[PDB]
Swiss-Prot record:
Compartment annotation: Host endoplasmic reticulum membrane
Name under which the protein is recorded: Papain-like protease nsp3
Catalytic activity: Thiol-dependent hydrolysis of ester, thioester, amide, peptide and isopeptide bonds formed by the C-terminal Gly of ubiquitin (a 76-residue protein attached to proteins as an intracellular targeting signal)
Residues of the full protein shown: 1025 to 1191 of 7096
Its membrane topology: Multi-pass membrane protein
Amino acid sequence: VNSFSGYLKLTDNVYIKNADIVEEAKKVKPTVVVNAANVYLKHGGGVAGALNKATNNAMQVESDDYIATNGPLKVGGSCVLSGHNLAKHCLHVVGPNVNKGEDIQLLKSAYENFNQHEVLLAPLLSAGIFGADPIHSLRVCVDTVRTNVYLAVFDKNLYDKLVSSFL
Ligand SMILES: CCc1c[nH]c2ncnc(NC[C@@](C)(O)C(C)C)c12
């Protein structure tokens, strides 16, 4: 039993809700919140900009130190950093950014990072400003992630479309 509330159950291990991941994380304080990161951990917009804003820019400060030490992530890769006031940990996961021309096959590799964590609060990878089809992102999520994932979808219209078209 966990503290996630109001989710619809899609499969044995995947759940979904129309919710702002920022407000959801502040309420649940999950062990792991997933950030829709880029390889430079420059949290400018989309989910990343919103999560970072909620940390009063502390996420960005931590991230800049991480990059200065380690260099950029790989597309499809991830790193675990602090969750600040939102979660115990933030798993920064880099899905491909279609608006940069990055291979969509890397979306599966990106979701594989979720399997290192027993429970996660997460956005759909590569959705929104990363330019991928969210219906496809949900399909890859369900077919790749084996751990318990709680997907927060900001747009109510998109949430309804995702539920109604799920196979
Ligand atoms: C600023 C973006 C954002 C803030 N809080 C969020 N929580 C969840 N998802 C988000 N964006 C991705 C998306 C695919 O769900 C959306 C575009 C329908 C956000």
